[PDB]
Amino acid sequence: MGDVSYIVDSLGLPPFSYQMSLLSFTEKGPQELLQLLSDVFSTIQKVDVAKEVPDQTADRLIGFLKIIKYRPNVQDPLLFRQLVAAGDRETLYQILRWVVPQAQLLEKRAFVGYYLSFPD
C-alpha cells in the first residue's frame, strides 16, 4: 500500500469500471489474485484458474507479461515463476500496480484488427 489504492482506483476506470473497496482487495488471497490478474488480461479467452494447475497459470501470465514488456523486480526468472505460481502478495501487487494503470492503452493496442469493421 498504497500500491493497493492505485490498483483499486485503476479498476474503477475503463475497461473494468468495477468498484472494489480498499479492504475487499487486501482480503484477497493467492488464488483470487491469480484470478484477478487472469481476468485483467482477459479484459485487455477468460479462464477459471481452478481449472488450471498453478504451473501453467504462471507460464500463461508470464507469457502475457513478456508480450507487454514487463520488467519484473525479481531478476531470477525461475524465482519469479514460482512466486507467480504461489500467488505471492508483493509480486502480484507489483504486477497489478504496473499493468492496471495503462490498461486502457494496452486494450486499445490489443483490440486492433480483431474486428472486421476495424482493420489493422
mmCIF file of C-alpha atoms in Angstrom, residues 29 58 81:
data_model
loop_
_atom_site.group_PDB
_atom_site.id
_atom_site.type_symbol
_atom_site.label_atom_id
_atom_site.label_comp_id
_atom_site.label_asym_id
_atom_site.label_seq_id
_atom_site.Cartn_x
_atom_site.Cartn_y
_atom_site.Cartn_z
ATOM 1 C CA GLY A 29 -5.679 -14.470 -1.127
ATOM 2 C CA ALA A 58 2.216 -18.941 -14.080
ATOM 3 C CA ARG A 81 7.901 -18.040 -11.976
#
